[PDB]
Amino acid sequence: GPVIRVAGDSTAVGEGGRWMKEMVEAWGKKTGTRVEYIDSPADTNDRLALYQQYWAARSPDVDVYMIDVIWPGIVAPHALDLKPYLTEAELKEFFPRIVQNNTIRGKLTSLPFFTDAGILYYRKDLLEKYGYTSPPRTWNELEQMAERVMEGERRAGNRDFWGFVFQGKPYEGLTCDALEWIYSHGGGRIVEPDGTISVNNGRAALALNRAHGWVGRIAPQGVTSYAEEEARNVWQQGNSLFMRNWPYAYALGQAEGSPIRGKFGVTVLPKASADAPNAATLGGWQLMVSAYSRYPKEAVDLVKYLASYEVQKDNAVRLSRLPTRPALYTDRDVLARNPWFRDLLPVFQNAVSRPSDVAGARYNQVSEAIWTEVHSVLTGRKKGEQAVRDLEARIRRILRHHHH
Numbered sequence: 001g002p003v004i005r006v007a008g009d010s011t012a013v014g015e016g017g018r019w020m021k022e023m024v025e026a027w028g029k030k031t032g033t034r035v036e037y038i039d040s041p042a043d044t045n046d047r048l049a050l051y052q053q054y055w056a057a058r059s060p061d062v063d064v065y066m067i068d069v070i071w072p073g074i075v076a077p078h079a080l081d082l083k084p085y086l087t088e089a090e091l092k093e094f095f096p097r098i099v100q101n102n103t104i105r106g107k108l109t110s111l112p113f114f115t116d117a118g119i120l121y122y123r124k125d126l127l128e129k130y131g132y133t134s135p136p137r138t139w140n141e142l143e144q145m146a147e148r149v150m151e152g153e154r155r156a157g158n159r160d161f162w163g164f165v166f167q168g169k170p171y172e173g174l175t176c177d178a179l180e181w182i183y184s185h186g187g188g189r190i191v192e193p194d195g196t197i198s199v200n201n202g203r204a205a206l207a208l209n210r211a212h213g214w215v216g217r218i219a220p221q222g223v224t225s226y227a228e229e230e231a232r233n234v235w236q237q238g239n240s241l242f243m244r245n246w247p248y249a250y251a252l253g254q255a256e257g258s259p260i261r262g263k264f265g266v267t268v269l270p271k272a273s274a275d276a277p278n279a280a281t282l283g284g285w286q287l288m289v290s291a292y293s294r295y296p297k298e299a300v301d302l303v304k305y306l307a308s309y310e311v312q313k314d315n316a317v318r319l320s321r322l323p324t325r326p327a328l329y330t331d332r333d334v335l336a337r338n339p340w341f342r343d344l345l346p347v348f349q350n351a352v353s354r355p356s357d358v359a360g361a362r363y364n365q366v367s368e369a370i371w372t373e374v375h376s377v378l379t380g381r382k383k384g385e386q387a388v389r390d391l392e393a394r395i396r397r398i399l400r401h402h403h404h
């Protein structure tokens, strides 16, 4: 019979790819369908380029793709419209904001699988040791805490110890970190939903200069090459007070044998001042049936399975990844494992989106401009004021003649 082939999450990021292959195998065993799992690179932008090779070729060699929240506007021609396959009631079981995101010119491109939001991870043992009772609410507090704890831990002999790790590599993860910096300083959304390119302002420039100030001081010099996992590995070894990352890091840090098991909490990222908005960049992944799949019915069945209550439950409980079904946030087992899902649900609901809706199919070009200009501030090549001016100009060229 058919072999249903899935290009799914990466085995290079935590347990995601191992787990996803397990889920696909479980579906194949349940239904008596042969399956194959095709692995992917760690970084989202590398995955997009890989999958574009298959799409350009109209390739039947992958049936189901796991796609980023920022992709529907790019990938829609390559997606089978799922709308006819779901009842209205079935679709309403997902958060409507994500279903809207996944719907392009009426085409339901993909089902919501897991959501994501940037959060602050903090070592609670170390805050207590150094006389702090709460995690930082402002970026200045984060810097002050990081300086004090670093000084102490270095003096105590840990030469590997840093105050803060984050994603500073030039890739899509930096666009996520940078949107959080800019929005949390009152600097806007880089490109507003209305199309206004707003990033050339003093608040956005300040946010970027602040981030530069961390590099080689409270964050490692090498943070300019860090993606999710490079940040996570410094943190997980016990060598960072703070980390910015996504929810998946939580289950991994609690695993038996983790040096930091039981020693951390999570909270919203800090902001410049009490009247700035909280920033948590919206992330998350969706499930797309290929327009080029020879087996649409089987592929849809697999996608509905992976997006189901019990598979999302398993993702929440085992991998601390955020469901796209509101019902799961009241499930007793989800909440007993991850109590912080309730504490931060409003942070996740208020997450700030990258400008993928307004940039549509040009989003990847926009994002490459963002991360390259931000990276130039981090590396010290440019100051934030010049970088936001230069980024404004770049994005203006990219979006010229694009209407949404």
Ligand SMILES: OC[C@H]1O[C@H](O[C@H]2[C@H](O)[C@@H](O)[C@@H](O)O[C@@H]2CO)[C@H](O)[C@@H](O)[C@@H]1O
Binding pocket: 009, 010, 013, 016, 042, 043, 044, 068, 069, 070, 115, 116, 172, 173, 174, 176, 228, 246, 248, 282, 283, 284, 285, 321
């Ligand atoms: O790097 C930006 C990218 O980060 C997140 O995707 C991670 C995800 O959290 C992991 O659990 C895993 O699946 O790998 C992903 C790719 O690194 C966001 O979900 C995604 O929206 C964002 O673009």
